Structure formats: C-alpha cells, structure tokens
Amino acid sequence: PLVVAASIIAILHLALWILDRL
Numbered sequence: 001p002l003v004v005a006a007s008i009i010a011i012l013h014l015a016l017w018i019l020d021r022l
C-alpha cells in the first residue's frame with residue numbers, strides 16, 4: 001500500500017507539473 005500511495009502521488013505531481021507549464 002505504501003508503494004501504491006507513493007506512485008499515485010508521484011504521477012499526480014507529474015501531471016500537475018506538466019499542466020502548469022503547458
């Protein structure tokens with residue numbers, strides 16, 4: 001479950017980081 005939680009946070013951060021810079 002920590003692997004899943006960390007991966008979700010990492011992917012959300014990636015998506016938001018890209019969005020901000022589009």
Ligand SMILES: CCCCCCCCO[C@@H]1O[C@H](CO)[C@@H](O)[C@H](O)[C@H]1O
Pocket residue numbers: 001003
């Ligand atoms: C790729 C990273 C390893 C993934 C391991 C998947 C097995 C998860 O491990 C399981 O976690 C569950 C907790 O809800 C429970 O079934 C057990 O406590 C644990 O064995």
